[PDB]
Amino acid sequence: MKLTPGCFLWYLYMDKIYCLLSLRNVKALMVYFHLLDVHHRNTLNDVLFFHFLQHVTNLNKSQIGMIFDLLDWTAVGEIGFDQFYVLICILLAHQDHLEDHFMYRHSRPVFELLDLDGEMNIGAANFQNYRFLFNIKKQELRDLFHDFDITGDRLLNYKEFKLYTIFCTDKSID
Amino acid sequence: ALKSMTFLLMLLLIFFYIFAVTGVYFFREYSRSTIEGLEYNMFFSDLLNSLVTVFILFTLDHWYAVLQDIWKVPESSRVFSSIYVILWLLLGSIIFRNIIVAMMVTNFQNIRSELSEEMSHLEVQYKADMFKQQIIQRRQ
């Protein structure tokens, strides 16, 4: 198989969701994970992930720790290879201008990435974590949160978040 | 609620300021009289003492006894002084007590209104939730 059928389907979805499907990007991510995974136990410790992030993205230690805490939903002290590949795809050379629009498109659900709680509501802490991950002004983030909170309960619904993302994509396309 | 204490305490302290500093030199002939038998003379003597005695008048404790002990001053037909202190104590006490209890009951009102609108929004979201669940079940 071409590195399992699930990864092939994920690559097909990425190619259908991005203009450029690159060349052996998933293979490069797998090789980087295998280099990071010293024991080859399909997992990596926090130190290895922090070292890889500092060597590649040159991110801060606190930001790397927050990203590892958000990505590791199982809370077992380790990050899986699939989680590392998902994080690398979420970054996707975030310094580029088109990377901001790609992150605005996000993924197929495009709701659970921001919502760390998982209760179909994104609080202020989740917005602060997203602003730490993706560069955005605090005033701009506050204005966007005020625009999104139509009811005023400081909660973001899945339909409301989808509508906001669709409006942002329509504004950026035009 | 004390965050909502923004301007009411400012008005309270400034009315305290103006009325106390006005009432310093109104019963001036009380401490500065040569009467041997007197025991509330120190109340109206100093500016800090004036603050203390108008705080006492605001708390409204033994105002009858206080006025009876200022009744030892030669009664000049009570034309301005007694009516001034009485109007000050009654107006300040009732107006400020009423305004603070009114502000705090409004604080409770808006706390409960925000709580009620949050539960109403939660119920509306739950209604849309099982409506979309029926839509999903039919779509399969």
UniProtKB/Swiss-Prot annotation, chain A:
Subcellular location: Cytoplasm; Cell projection, Cilium, Flagellum
Gene Ontology MF terms: calcium ion binding; calcium ion sensor activity; calmodulin binding
Disrupted gene: phenotype observed: Mice are normal but males show severe male subfertility despite normal sperm morphology. Subfertility is caused by defects in sperm motility: spermatozoa have a lower basal level of intracellular calcium and aberrant Ca(2+) homeostasis.
GO cellular component, one term: CatSper complex
Tissue: Testis-specific.
Domain EF-hand per the UniProt entry, residue ranges: 59-94, 100-135, 136-171
Biological process annotations from GO: flagellated sperm motility; sperm capacitation; spermatogenesis
Domain of life from the UniProt record: Eukaryota
Residues involved in Ca(2+) 1 binding: N60, S62, D69
Binding site for Ca(2+) 2: D149, D153, E160
Keywords: Calcium, Calmodulin-binding, Cell projection, Cilium, Cytoplasm, Differentiation, Flagellum, Metal-binding, Repeat, Spermatogenesis
Primary location recorded for the protein, binned into one broad class: cytoplasm
Quaternary structure, from the entry: Component of the CatSper complex or CatSpermasome composed of the core pore-forming members CATSPER1, CATSPER2, CATSPER3 and CATSPER4 as well as auxiliary members CATSPERB, CATSPERG2, CATSPERD, CATSPERE, CATSPERZ, C2CD6/CATSPERT, SLCO6C1, TMEM249, TMEM262 and EFCAB9. HSPA1 may be an additional auxiliary complex member. The core complex members CATSPER1, CATSPER2, CATSPER3 and CATSPER4 form a heterotetrameric channel.
Name used for this protein in its record: EF-hand calcium-binding domain-containing protein 9
Taxonomic source organism: Mus musculus (Mouse)
UniProt lineage: Eukaryota, Metazoa, Chordata, Craniata, Vertebrata
Gene assigned in the entry: Efcab9
Residues of the full protein shown: 1 to 174 of 216
Curated annotation (Swiss-Prot), chain B:
Intramembrane segments: 46-58
Broad class of the protein's primary localization: membrane
Result of knocking out the encoding gene: Mice are normal but males are sterile. Male sterility is due to defects in sperm motility unability to fertilize intact eggs. In mice lacking Catsper1, the sperm lacks CatSper2, while in mice lacking CatSper1, the sperm lacks CatSper1, suggesting that stable expression of CatSper1 requires CatSper2 and vice versa.
TM region positions: 4-26, 79-105
Residue ranges that the UniProt entry lists as topological domain Extracellular: 27-45, 59-78
GO CC annotation: CatSper complex; sperm flagellum
Tissues in which the protein is found: Testis-specific.
Compartment annotation: Cell projection, Cilium, Flagellum membrane
Domain of life: Eukaryota
Keywords tagged on the record: Calcium, Calcium channel, Calcium transport, Cell membrane, Cell projection, Cilium, Developmental protein, Differentiation, Flagellum, Ion channel, Ion transport, Membrane, Spermatogenesis, Transmembrane, Transmembrane helix, Transport, Voltage-gated channel
One example of a Gene Ontology biological process annotation: calcium ion transport
GO terms for MF: calcium-activated cation channel activity; voltage-gated calcium channel activity
Similarity comment: family membership: Belongs to the cation channel sperm-associated (TC 1.A.1.19) family.
Subunit structure: Component of the CatSper complex or CatSpermasome composed of the core pore-forming members CATSPER1, CATSPER2, CATSPER3 and CATSPER4 as well as auxiliary members CATSPERB, CATSPERG2, CATSPERD, CATSPERE, CATSPERZ, C2CD6/CATSPERT, SLCO6C1, TMEM249, TMEM262 and EFCAB9. HSPA1 may be an additional auxiliary complex member. The core complex members CATSPER1, CATSPER2, CATSPER3 and CATSPER4 form a heterotetrameric channel.
Role noted for this protein: Pore-forming subunit of the CatSper complex, a sperm-specific voltage-gated calcium channel that plays a central role in sperm cell hyperactivation. Controls calcium entry to mediate the hyperactivated motility, a step needed for sperm motility which is essential late in the preparation of sperm for fertilization.
Protein name in the entry: Cation channel sperm-associated protein 2
Native source species: Mus musculus (Mouse)
Residues represented out of the complete protein: 235 to 374 of 588
